[PDB]
Amino acid sequence: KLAIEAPRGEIKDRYGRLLAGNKNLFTVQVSGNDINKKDANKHSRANEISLKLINLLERNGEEYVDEFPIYVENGKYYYTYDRDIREYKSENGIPNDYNAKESFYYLVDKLISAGILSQEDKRLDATRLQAKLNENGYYPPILVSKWMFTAERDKRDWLASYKIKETKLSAKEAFEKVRNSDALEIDKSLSDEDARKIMVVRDLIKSKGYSQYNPVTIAKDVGETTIAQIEESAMDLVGVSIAVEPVRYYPNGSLASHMLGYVGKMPSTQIESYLQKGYETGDMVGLAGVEKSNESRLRGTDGYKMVKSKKPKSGDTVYLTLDKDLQEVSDNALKQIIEVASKGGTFKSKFGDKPISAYAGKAQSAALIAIDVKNGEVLASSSYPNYDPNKFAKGISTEDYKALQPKNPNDLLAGSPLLNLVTQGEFQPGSSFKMLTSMAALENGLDPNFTINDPGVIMLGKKSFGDYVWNHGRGNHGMTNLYKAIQESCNIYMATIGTGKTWPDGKSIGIDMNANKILEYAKLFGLDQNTGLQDEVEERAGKVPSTEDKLKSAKWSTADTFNLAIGQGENAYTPAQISRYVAAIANGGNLVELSVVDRAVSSDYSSVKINDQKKVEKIPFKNPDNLKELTKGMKLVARQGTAKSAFADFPIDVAAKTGTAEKSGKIPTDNEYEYLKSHMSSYNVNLNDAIKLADKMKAEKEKELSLAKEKEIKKKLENKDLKDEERKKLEEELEDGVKVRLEDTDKVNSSYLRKAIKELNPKITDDQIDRFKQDYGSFTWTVAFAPADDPEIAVVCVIPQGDSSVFSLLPTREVIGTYMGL
Ligand SMILES: *C(=O)[C@@H](NC(=O)[C@H](N)c1ccccc1)[C@@H]1N[C@@H](C(=O)O)C(C)(C)S1
Ligand SMILES: [Zn+2]
Numbered sequence: 056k057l058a059i060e061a062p063r064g065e066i067k068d069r070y071g072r073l074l075a076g077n078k079n080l081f082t083v084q085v086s087g088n089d090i091n092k093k094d095a096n097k098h099s100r101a102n103e104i105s106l107k108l109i110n111l112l113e114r115n116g117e118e119y120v121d122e123f124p125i126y127v128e129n130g131k132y133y134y135t136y137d138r139d140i141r142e143y144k145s146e147n148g149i150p151n152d153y154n155a156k157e158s159f160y161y162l163v164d165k166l167i168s169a170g171i172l173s174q175e176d177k178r179l180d181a182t183r184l185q186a187k188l189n190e191n192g193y194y195p196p197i198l199v200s201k202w203m204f205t206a207e208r209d210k211r212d213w214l215a216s217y218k219i220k221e222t223k224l225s226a227k228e229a230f231e232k233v234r235n236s237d238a239l240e241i242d243k244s245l246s247d248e249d250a251r252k253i254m255v256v257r258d259l260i261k262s263k264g265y266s267q268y269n270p271v272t273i274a275k276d277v278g279e280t281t282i283a284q285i286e287e288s289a290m291d292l293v294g295v296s297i298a299v300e301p302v303r304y305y306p307n308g309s310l311a312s313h314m315l316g317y318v319g320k321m322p323s324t325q326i327e328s329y330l331q332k333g334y335e336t337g338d339m340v341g342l343a344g345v346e347k348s349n350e351s352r353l354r355g356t357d358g359y360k361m362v363k364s365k366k367p368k369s370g371d372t373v374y375l376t377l378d379k380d381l382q383e384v385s386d387n388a389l390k391q392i393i394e395v396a397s398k399g400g401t402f403k404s405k406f407g408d409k410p411i412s413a414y415a416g417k418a419q420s421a422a423l424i425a426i427d428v429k430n431g432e433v434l435a436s437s438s439y440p441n442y443d444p445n446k447f448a449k450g451i452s453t454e455d456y457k458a459l460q461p462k463n464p465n466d467l468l469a470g471s472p473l474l475n476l477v478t479q480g481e482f483q484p485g486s487s488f489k490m491l492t493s494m495a496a497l498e499n500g501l502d503p504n505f506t507i508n509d510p511g512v513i514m515l516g517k518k519s520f521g522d523y524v525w526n527h528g529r530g531n532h533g534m535t536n537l538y539k540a541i542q543e544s545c546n547i548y549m550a551t552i553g554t555g556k557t558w559p560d561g562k563s564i565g566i567d568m569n570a571n572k573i574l575e576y577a578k579l580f581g582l583d584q585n586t587g588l589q590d591e592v593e594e595r596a597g598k599v600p601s602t603e604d605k606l607k608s609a610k611w612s613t614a615d616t617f618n619l620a621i622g623q624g625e626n627a628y629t630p631a632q633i634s635r636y637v638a639a640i641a642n643g644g645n646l647v648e649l650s651v652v653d654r655a656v657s658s659d660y661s662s663v664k665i666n667d668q669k670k671v672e673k674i675p676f677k678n679p680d681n682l683k684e685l686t687k688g689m690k691l692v693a694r695q696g697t698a699k700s701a702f703a704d705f706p707i708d709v710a711a712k713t714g715t716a717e718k719s720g721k722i723p724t725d726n727e728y729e730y731l732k733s734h735m736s737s738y739n740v741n742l743n744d745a746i747k748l749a750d751k752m753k754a755e756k757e758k759e760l761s762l763a764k765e766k767e768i769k770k771k772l773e774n775k776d777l778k779d780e781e782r783k784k785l786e787e788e789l790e791d792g793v794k795v796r797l798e799d800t801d802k803v804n805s806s807y808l809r810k811a812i813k814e815l816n817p818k819i820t821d822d823q824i825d826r827f828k829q830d831y832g833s834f835t836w837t838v839a840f841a842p843a844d845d846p847e848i849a850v851v852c853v854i855p856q857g858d859s860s861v862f863s864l865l866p867t868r869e870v871i872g873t874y875m876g877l
Pocket of ligand 1: 717
């Protein structure tokens with residue numbers, strides 16, 4: 056019974072253009088049996104052929120599998136195992152001199168402090184506590200049982216297999232054992248550079264198991280020269296052969312990488328899982344995006360033979376909803392606005408260029424989605440930075456995935472390229488949320504023409520709330536009704552109808568409006584629900600701030616109402632959510648369930664519409680004609696409002712709202728205590744003096760708590776009728792002396808170091824102490840639907856930390872333009 060693998064189903068675009076398909080490659084395979092069987096010779100020919108093969112490939116410039124666990128970086132021998140531990144610790148802020156148990160709890164402490172666990176949960180059966188981490192999404196490479204790192208155990212089991220049960224820690228000395236090994240018995244005459252090159256092949260073959268099912272692929276892709284010299288030089292290279300193997304390939308490279316996703320190695324965690332589902336070991340699998348969601352479908356139905364014969368059926372071809380041609384525009388447009396904002400320059404546009412400032416340097420990431428407002432079909436979805444799915448095809452999880460794929464600063468809004476910002480970046484909505492505020496107000500009787508003489512600022516607090524024009528110059532909007540409000544983005548107007556009062560001069564207006572009702576409408580526009588993509592691709596949906604979860608643990612502040620009413624406060628939603636919200640305005644008030652997987656076609660050209668059952672459910676508005684006001688305003692934004700700069704001389708009637716959201720405060724560090732330490736000098740304090748003092752403050756608190764604990768125990772002991780067993784426990788506490796200890800978390804250890812800094816420099820502020828941390832920063836937005844009077848397309852474009860609002864409009868214009876067939 057042999058393993059005949061089915062050809063992987065293709066992924067195509069809406070119109071049938073190949074996005075992901077298969078191609079054949081020449082691999083160099085090596086037979087274990089053949090290379091290292093002997094008859095009369097003491098030594099097999101293995102190490103002689105091994106050394107010959109690598110050198111051959113090396114000369115010809117062929118890339119070859121090298122998963123031998125000891126490397127040479129600068130005459131220094133290092134374990135891959137070990138590098139893997141200390142690289143894991145960096146990415147969580149665990150001090151590299153922490154052992155596995157210490158490393159483990161550090162990660163628990165991390166999440167308790169973060170409101171993900173409780174201080175009580177902190178102690179449990181480690182297995183139950185690991186089970187709490189895993190289901191919660193943190194998989195930390197540690198064996199709870201022996202309190203040791205997986206990759207350290209694997210270092211044991213490797214030295215066990217070459218019968219080196221003596222674990223004196225060594226890399227170069229261990230290399231020699233394995234070289235001069237019983238089971239490999241290399242020539243002592245040879246070079247140490249040559250020996251490793253042999254061990255590469257010898258360890259490959261040895262790691263694949265005892266029974267040695269089939270040959271072993273030593274090089275996954277080779278030129279015409281090698282295939283000649285391996286077939287030619289056949290008499291030397293006994294076990295060596297050429298095979299043809301199919302690989303996955305993405306013709307258009309990184310185009311739509313996140314939606315498509317990628318195939319790679321089974322994550323070793325799950326190998327067991329996949330072998331129970333009937334996969335072979337060498338098999339590649341869907342790891343992200345549609346490649347993963349439709350893994351079963353694309354996998355096909357593989358076949359078998361005996362040879363002591365049934366044909367495999369190929370995977371169904373999966374058609375996405377994306378337009379290959381609209382996707383290119385959106386990927387290219389996002390790529391431009393970041394690379395031009397990098398340094399400086401200008402943005403080229405089929406629809407008339409614009410130069411952009413150089414000092415917009417903080418902007419690294421960006422996202423954009425365009426959907427069919429009638430049926431939720433996702434026509435283009437684009438997140439930057441991104442990745443070439445082709446680099447995972449072969450199975451490069453060792454290094455190049457660790458080199459460039461996870462990124463700064465373990466907060467993904469500016470960071471990792473694997474992240475699909477369109478479905479996984481929760482951002483502050485911005486002022487797009489203003490048509491949502493307005494809708495609810497309109498629906499509580501507001502007259503669009505209600506006009507106010509614009510202060511530019513409310514001074515309800517000691518602190519001030521004001522229009523952007525009033526925050527820069529002494530600003531004003533003057534005579535403002537809803538239409539001018541939406542058109543120039545007046546924040547005051549929005550606060551006033553938000554609260555349904557006038558501040559602070561008259562209080563109530565003719566309408567019953569409040570933060571709860573603003574969130575009631577946010578809910579109705581489906582900002583509380585998953586988009587529809589949740590089961591097609593990786594999505595991390597936002598949640599509408601719960602008014603109910605405030606009460607059960609007073610009401611909403613009338614400055615929590617102000618912010619919330621202009622897309623600030625705890626609002627935080629994916630751009631794909633915002634896409635549905637805007638679609639509902641655009642399509643007369645219908646909440647469309649989004650789709651990115653359109654249909655599938657079998658080998659036998661049978662088809663099926665997958666996005667067939669996608670809810671298009673009518674939002675129960677007290678009067679959907681109200682949505683016509685939101686448009687009327689949104690059109691003025693394009694005609695003579697904030698977005699006039701880009702949309703005024705534009706063939707298409709476009710309804711747009713701009714935005715920019717400032718999220719307050721700093722992004723917390725991996726390790727607060729290390730932070731304070733590494734920044735002590737800049738606070739004009741001495742580390743030793745700071746540390747010493749912090750320890751004194753802790754010892755001072757430990758005493759204070761001991762004294763009180765003592766009083767408490769003595770008081771319990773004064774209680775007559777206190778069953779003996781308890782009286783004995785309370786006595787056994789005291790009987791030695793009570794010595795209370797603070798936990799020795801990072802939250803605690805740091806709390807004191809901070810307190811000590813504040814003493815030793817009595818003028819320094821908290822903000823000054825925290826200046827070196829990353830800012831959550833600003834995010835600049837644009838949402839639009841076209842053509843305004845009979846809309847077909849809704850587009851949403853976010854650039855976190857973009858300078859002007861023009862960065863958001865320019866990709867939204869290119870995409871609108873291209874869709875409309877200009
Ligand atoms: C909506 O997002 C509004 N933005 C704000 O109120 C923020 N407090 C803010 C953050 C960063 C810079 C300035 C203000 C209005 N809409 C914006 C737009 O459409 O571009 C705005 C700049 C007119 S303010
Ligand atoms: Zn105003």
